[PDB]
Structures are given as structure tokens and as C-alpha cells.
Amino acid sequence: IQRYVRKDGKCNVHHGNVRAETLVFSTHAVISMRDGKLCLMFRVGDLRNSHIVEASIRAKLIKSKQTSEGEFIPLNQTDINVGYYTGDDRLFLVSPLIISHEINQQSPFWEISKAQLPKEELEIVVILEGMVEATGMTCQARSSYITSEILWGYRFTPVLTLEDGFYEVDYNSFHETYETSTPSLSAKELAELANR
Amino acid sequence: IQRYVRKDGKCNVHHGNVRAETLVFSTHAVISMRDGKLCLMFRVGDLRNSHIVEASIRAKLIKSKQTSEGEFIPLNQTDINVGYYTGDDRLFLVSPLIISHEINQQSPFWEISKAQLPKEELEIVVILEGMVEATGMTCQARSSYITSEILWGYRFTPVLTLEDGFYEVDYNSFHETYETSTPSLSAKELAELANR
Amino acid sequence: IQRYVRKDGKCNVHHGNVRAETLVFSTHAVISMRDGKLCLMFRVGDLRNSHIVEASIRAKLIKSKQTSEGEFIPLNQTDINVGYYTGDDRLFLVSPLIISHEINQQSPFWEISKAQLPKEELEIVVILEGMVEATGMTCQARSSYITSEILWGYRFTPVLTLEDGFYEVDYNSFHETYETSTPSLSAKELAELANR
Amino acid sequence: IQRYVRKDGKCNVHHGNVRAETLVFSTHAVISMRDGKLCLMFRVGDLRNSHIVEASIRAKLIKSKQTSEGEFIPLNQTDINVGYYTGDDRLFLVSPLIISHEINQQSPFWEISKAQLPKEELEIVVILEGMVEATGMTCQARSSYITSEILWGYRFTPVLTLEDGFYEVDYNSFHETYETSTPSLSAKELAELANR
Numbered sequence: 001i002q003r004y005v006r007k008d009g010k011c012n013v014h015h016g017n018v019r020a021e022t023l024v025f026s027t028h029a030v031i032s033m034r035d036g037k038l039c040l041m042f043r044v045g046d047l048r049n050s051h052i053v054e055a056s057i058r059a060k061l062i063k064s065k066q067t068s069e070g071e072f073i074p075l076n077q078t079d080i081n082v083g084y085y086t087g088d089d090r091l092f093l094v095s096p097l098i099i100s101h102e103i104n105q106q107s108p109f110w111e112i113s114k115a116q117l118p119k120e121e122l123e124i125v126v127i128l129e130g131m132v133e134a135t136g137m138t139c140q141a142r143s144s145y146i147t148s149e150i151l152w153g154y155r156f157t158p159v160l161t162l163e164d165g166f167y168e169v170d171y172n173s174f175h176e177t178y179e180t181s182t183p184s185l186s187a188k189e190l191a192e193l194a195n196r
Numbered sequence: 197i198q199r200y201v202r203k204d205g206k207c208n209v210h211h212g213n214v215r216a217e218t219l220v221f222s223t224h225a226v227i228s229m230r231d232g233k234l235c236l237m238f239r240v241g242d243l244r245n246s247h248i249v250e251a252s253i254r255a256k257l258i259k260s261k262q263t264s265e266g267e268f269i270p271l272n273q274t275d276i277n278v279g280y281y282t283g284d285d286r287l288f289l290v291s292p293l294i295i296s297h298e299i300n301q302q303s304p305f306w307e308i309s310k311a312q313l314p315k316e317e318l319e320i321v322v323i324l325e326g327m328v329e330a331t332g333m334t335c336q337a338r339s340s341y342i343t344s345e346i347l348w349g350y351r352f353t354p355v356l357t358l359e360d361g362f363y364e365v366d367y368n369s370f371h372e373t374y375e376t377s378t379p380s381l382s383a384k385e386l387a388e389l390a391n392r
Numbered sequence: 393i394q395r396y397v398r399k400d401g402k403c404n405v406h407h408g409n410v411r412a413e414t415l416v417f418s419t420h421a422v423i424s425m426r427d428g429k430l431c432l433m434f435r436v437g438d439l440r441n442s443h444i445v446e447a448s449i450r451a452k453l454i455k456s457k458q459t460s461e462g463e464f465i466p467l468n469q470t471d472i473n474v475g476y477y478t479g480d481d482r483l484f485l486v487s488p489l490i491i492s493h494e495i496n497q498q499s500p501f502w503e504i505s506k507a508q509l510p511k512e513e514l515e516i517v518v519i520l521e522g523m524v525e526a527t528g529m530t531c532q533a534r535s536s537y538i539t540s541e542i543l544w545g546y547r548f549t550p551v552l553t554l555e556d557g558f559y560e561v562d563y564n565s566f567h568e569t570y571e572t573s574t575p576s577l578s579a580k581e582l583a584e585l586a587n588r
Numbered sequence: 589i590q591r592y593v594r595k596d597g598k599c600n601v602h603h604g605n606v607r608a609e610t611l612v613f614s615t616h617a618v619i620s621m622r623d624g625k626l627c628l629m630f631r632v633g634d635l636r637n638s639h640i641v642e643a644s645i646r647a648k649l650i651k652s653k654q655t656s657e658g659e660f661i662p663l664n665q666t667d668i669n670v671g672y673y674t675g676d677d678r679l680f681l682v683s684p685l686i687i688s689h690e691i692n693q694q695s696p697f698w699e700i701s702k703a704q705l706p707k708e709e710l711e712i713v714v715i716l717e718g719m720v721e722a723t724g725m726t727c728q729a730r731s732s733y734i735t736s737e738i739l740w741g742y743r744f745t746p747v748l749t750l751e752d753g754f755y756e757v758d759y760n761s762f763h764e765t766y767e768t769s770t771p772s773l774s775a776k777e778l779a780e781l782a783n784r
């Protein structure tokens with residue numbers, strides 16, 4: 001068993017690091033099963049040469065909507081749950097992490113099947129906020145996922161490998177995804193079918 | 197589909213911006229139905245020439261009250277729910293947003309009918325707190341809505357329009373509202389009637 | 393109706409203010425009924441010549457305890473609920489406020505009767521944290537209430553008075569309390585009695 | 589009764605203090621009963637010569653896992669509950685505190701018996717974040733507990749002693765633990781047995 005963080009708080013990642021360079025999000029986001037729950041996931045990179053303290057991830061769904069009373073809201077925003085309730089949005093960012101939004105009843109994608117996806121007009125804004133340790137100052141990074149950038153039935157490729165008592169990140173594969181068997185029904189549709 | 201935020205985190209609003217100038221709240225607040233729920237809503241402007249990180253909205257109700265034991269609290273404060281529970285008060289402020297407080301059982305307006313409104317002695321203090329990205333420092337903006345400034349049965353006019361692959365804001369209409377069909381009963385009264 | 397906060401965010405308190413001087417907590421804390429609920433309350437002062445942004449109140453109970461397994465914890469700490477769940481601990485501090493902890497089942501005082509109070513060995517640490525607007529920096533103020541400093545069956549005297557379209561604070565009375573009719577049974581005892 | 593904190597916010601710990609020196613976590617973590625609940629606990633030290641404001645503790649479980657769909661997550665992170673829900677992770681750090689994670693159904697250790705412990709490949713990362721009062725800046729401290737560093741059926745030795753109206757900390761014993769009678773069944777196993 002090779003430790004991830006040593007007793008003194010120093011992490012064992014990127015052999016010979018120094019703990020502006022910019023933080024990256026994967027180009028695409030994927031949707032696929034994790035433990036019988038359907039999920040939307042995107043990857044968030046670290047900063048090779050500093051920690052980010054009080055680091056947090058959040059996401060907004062941007063989608064123009066019409067209320068049952070006919071009020072039209074251009075580019076309405078609602079929050080996507082990526083760990084707010086359990087503090088799993090309080091990231092320990094010391095290597096690329098896959099953030100996961102479980103597609104449940106209060107999720108906006110609850111009624112969206114695979115066929116249905118490309119028909120929807122929406123954008124997922126991902127927003128990472130923290131305090132760059134070295135800089136002293138509060139930073140923010142953002143990105144965006146549009147309908148055509150969400151890949152149904154895929155998973156993120158692993159990027160973490162242990163080499164010589166240090167964990168190294170194959171950054172080439174950061175953005176890379178592979179296909180996996182994934183039902184094509186909506187989260188709602190799977191739940192109904194599951195319940196009889 | 198024209199993106200709101202580009203892959204690199206740069207938003208497509210206010211063609212040719214630079215991302216002290218002061219943040220504005222609409223002059224008035226409106227109350228009206230959104231998806232069968234009665235709502236109080238106010239608009240919060242952005243800062244044309246910077247983002248506001250770790251941006252959050254909150255509101256206090258100021259109203260002198262008397263306890264069932266006869267204790268009089270001048271200008272008592274209680275919190276108005278504008279997304280605290282679901283992180284929808286964690287704003288992504290890159291254009292004017294309508295903030296919405298759904299008038300439910302734990303809301304202070306739950307028992308307030310249209311006729312009843314102008315009789316009540318109360319004030320809604322809205323408070324926006326964030327970290328002006330360019331400035332480095334934590335800012336706070338406030339405003340106030342008194343009974344006579346709350347407009348029952350109205351909605352905010354849309355201000356967002358897509359022009360030339362950039363979203364522009366018709367700031368003339370920022371404060372403007374229009375009337376819409378809205379029952380005159382209290383949220384409580386509508387619920388009771390609804391439940392038989 | 394004289395506004396508390398004007399449209400531009402400027403409050404109408406302390407006619408002719410400038411918005412180190414130190415923030416004060418009342419010397420004593422009181423326990424008494426508010427709307428059929430028993431409460432512990434302490435007063436927290438403002439800073440006459442600046443706002444405090446992202447202001448929050450919290451309290452710890454310090455009391456040495458012994459676990460059912462015989463482990464002795466000197467000066468154990470547990471959190472006192474003063475609005476954490478509903479964001480009513482996110483203070484809008486622009487004049488002295490009475491903070492209230494409702495003495496319910498999850499409260500530590502739930503089983504403490506009036507007679508019982510002076511027998512208990514405990515301390516309430518109150519801690520106010522914010523960002524002094526003028527200073528730019530994060531501040532913290534603390535105080536302490538010991539058994540003998542908690543006054544059962546009392547209330548805080550009002551200190552807020554409207555004079556000449558500005559709200560003034562009679563700081564002489566900041567610390568002053570008066571007696572009021574208050575049962576002597578514990579919160580638990582009142583609940584049981586209430587439930588038959 | 590000797591006060592822990594005086595009326596003016598000054599604490600009565602470390603007679604003759606000044607309120608870089610580094611913050612320490614105990615070398616080991618222990619698991620044992622507190623009030624019929626099984627717990628994992630680690631100790632977190634203070635900074636002798638300053639307070640830490642907006643201080644908070646959090647912990648991540650690092651453990652490589654495989655999803656029921658065969659996706660392998662190297663060094664997956666999930667949050668350990670150390671008071672997030674009740675604000676007991678908002679520390680009042682003015683002397684060494686034992687932080688406690690109660691091993692309940694949503695805890696990752698729920699199914700881990702004593703025998704089972706040394707077989708598991710996992711790491712507990714503890715992360716303390718605050719604002720060093722004197723420094724003005726936001727700090728972060730971290731440490732790590734691996735399987736072999738978790739001591740089953742033990743407790744932390746008390747380190748706090750009252751001497752001459754000041755509380756002193758016997759820092760020699762900071763890391764020291766003693767054994768105590770503790771069942772060897774998992775939290776799950778104890779619950780089942782308990783429920784008949």
C-alpha cells in the first residue's frame with residue numbers, strides 16, 4: 001500500500017513538484033451507470049504546482065424554459081447537484097477527479113432518454129472556486145457542456161498510475177473516454193421498469 | 197444553439213467587455229405564479245466589467261412583531277428562503293437574474309392575500325455578497341423593498357436577447373414589469389382551496 | 393412607515409455615521425418563552441462605523457462530560473443551534489440583535505429546569521465572524537456565559553427607537569434585562585405536561 | 589468553576605501566550621464506543637500563538653473501488669462525516685480537540701469489523717482549513733491515516749489540566765492512546781445484534 005498523502009500533509013503526486021498555469025475541465029461529459037444509478041460525470045483537473053484550499057465544485061443548468069403560466073425564462077438557471085448535500089462538492093484537489101451528478105428525481109435529466117438527449121437545448125456550466133495556496137487569492141474556473149458535448153453510455157479513462165512511490169498522471173488521457181454498456185432509457189424510465 | 201459560456205470559461209455576454217461601477221437591484225419586486233406556486237421575485241443585476249466569485253444572495257424580512265407572551269420585537273429579522281437549501285442562492289452572475297422566493301408554508305407571506313399586502317408593515321432587505329474578481333476584495337450590495345414597492349400579480353420583463361453570437365442585455369427594461377393574470381387569494385388560501 | 397434600509401443600500405441607523413472599535417455582546421444571557429417555545433437568548437452589538445459582511449453567529453457549549461463507557465471528556469464542545477439550519481445565523485448586523493436558541497429536543501438545555509440551572513457546570517461561548525467592510529480583513533469576536541450569567545425567566549429590554557427618520561440605539565440599555573412570567577419547568581418537562 | 593473564555597473573548601489557555609509554527613494531528617486514529625455508538629476519532633492540535641477563524645475540519649476516505657458495472661476507480665474519494673450536518677465541524681480551536689466520526693449506516697466503516705480492518709486498503713485524509721488571525725491569510729493543514737494507523741478499541745488520553753486559573757496542555761501526551769473494552773464486531777454487526 002503506497003500512501004496518497006504523507007503524515008506531514010505532503011501528497012505523493014507529480015514526483016518533483018513545487019507545492020500562471022490554468023486549471024482544465026474535460027472537453028466532454030459522459031453519462032453512465034454507477035452502482036445501478038444513472039450518472040452525468042465530468043472531469044476536473046488539478047493545478048500541478050499548488051493546492052487549492054476551500055476548493056468547491058458547483059454546476060448550473062442553463063436552459064430556456066416556459067412556466068405553466070406562459071412566462072418565458074430565457075436561459076433559466078437551476079442548480080445541478082454535485083455533492084452539495086453531503087460535502088462531496090468540497091473537493092480535495094490533488095489530481096484529476098471525476099465529479100458525478102447522480103441523475104435522480106430532483107435532477108433535471110431525470111426524464112431525458114438517450115434518444116431524447118440530442119433534441120434538448122441546454123448547457124451545463126461547471127464552476128470551480130478555491131483559494132490558490134501560493135497566490136493567496138481566490139480563483140474561479142469555468143467551462144461549458146452543450147447537448148452535443150454530452151456522451152451517453154461512456155466512461156472516463158483512468159489517468160492515475162503508481163510509479164516509484166509517487167502517483168503520476170497520464171495527462172494525455174485526461175480528456176479521453178471509452179464506451180460501455182449502458183441502457184438507453186431515461187433515469188425515470190429505468191426506475192419505473194425497475195419497480196414491478 | 198448559441199453557447200452562453202465558451203469552453204475556456206469566457207461568457208458570451210456584453211460584446212466587447214473587459215472581464216468602481218455599482219451593482220443594481222430592480223426598484224420593485226413582483227408576486228405571481230410560477231408552475232402553480234406563488235412567488236415573490238426581485239431582479240439582481242450583474243457587474244458589466246467583472247465576475248463576482250463565491251457570489252450569494254440572501255434576504256431578510258424586517259417586520260416588528262409581538263410574541264404570544266407579549267414581548268415586542270421592533271424590526272424583527274427572519275430569513276427569506278431564496279435557495280439556501282438547494283444552493284440556488286449560489287448565483288452565477290453574468291447577466292441580470294430574477295431571484296425567486298416560493299411563498300410556501302415556512303414563508304412569511306404564506307398568509308398574505310393581495311388585499312392584505314398594502315396593510316402590512318414590512319421590508320424585504322436583499323443582500324448580495326461576493327468577491328469582485330478584478331478587485332480581489334469581498335463586496336456587498338443591499339437594497340430594500342417596502343410594502344408599497346411589492347407589485348402583486350406582475351412579472352419581470354425579459355431583458356436578454358441574442359445578437360450576433362453574443363448575448364446582449366437591454367438595460368432599459370431592467371426595472372420594467374408587466375401585469376399577468378394572478379389569483380388574489382393568499383398562498384395559504386390557494387392551498388386550502390386546492391385541497392378538496 | 394420609516395424605512396430601515398434605503399433603496400441604495402444605505403441603512404437609516406446612527407444618524408451621521410461613517411459607513412479600532414470593538415464589538416460587544418451583552419454581559420448576560422436570558423431564558424424565556426417566545427411563542428410557546430422556551431429560548432436562550434443573548435444580544436450581539438454592531439460596529440457603529442462599519443458593516444460586517446458574510447457575518448455569522450455560532451455558539452459552542454463547553455461542558456465536561458462522561459460517556460456511558462466511562463470516558464471522561466474535559467470541557468467537551470458541542471454546537472448550540474442559533475439558526476444554522478435556516479440561515480438565520482447569517483446576520484444582518486446594522487444594530488444590536490437578540491440571537492435566539494430555541495431549547496428543543498436536540499438542544500443541550502432540553503432537560504434543564506430553573507432549579508437545575510445553577511447546579512450545572514457549563515459555559516456558552518459565543519463567536520461572531522465576519523469581514524469588516526472598511527478593514528478588508530476577516531474579524532472574530534467572542535464572549536462567554538457561565539451558569540451564573542444565565543438569567544432564567546427574563547427578557548432583553550428594547551434598545552431601538554425611531555427619531556427624526558433615523559433609527560437610534562439607546563446603548564445604555566444594551567445590557568439591561570427585565571423579568572417576565574416564565575414557567576420554572578424544563579423544556580422537556582413542559583413538553584411532556586403539554587402532551588396530554 | 590474556572591472559565592474557559594473570559595468576558596472579553598480572551599481564552600484562559602497556555603498561560604502567557606501571544607494571541608511560522610505548524611499545526612499537528614495525532615499520529616494515529618482510534619475506534620471505540622461513545623454512548624453506545626461506535627466511533628472513529630482523531631485529534632487535532634491548536635496553534636499555540638494564534639487563533640484560527642472560520643476554522644473547519646473535513647475528511648476524505650481514499651479507497652480504490654469497483655462499481656457494480658465493473659468501472660474501476662483508483663483511489664476514489666468519498667466524504668467522511670465529522671459534523672458537517674450540525675456545524676460541529678466548525679471548530680473552536682483553542683486547544684487540542686478530539687474530532688469524532690460516528691460509524692453509522694452512511695459511514696464507510698459501517699461494515700468493517702476489527703478483524704476486517706487490517707485487510708482493507710484505505711486512507712483517511714484529514715484536512716483543517718481556517719484563517720490564521722495574526723497572518724490574515726487562509727491556511728490549510730493535512731494529514732493521513734492508513735489502515736495500519738487506525739487503532740481499534742482504543743481512546744485518546746486526556747491532555748487538558750487546570751493549573752492556577754489557566755488551562756494547560758500536556759503536549760507530551762497529545763499523541764498517546766490507551767486501550768479500553770470495545771466489542772470486535774462491525775458497527776453493522778452490533779446494530780443487527782442490538783435489534784432483537
Ligand SMILES: [Ba+2]
Nearest residue numbers: 054250446642
Ligand atoms: Ba471566505
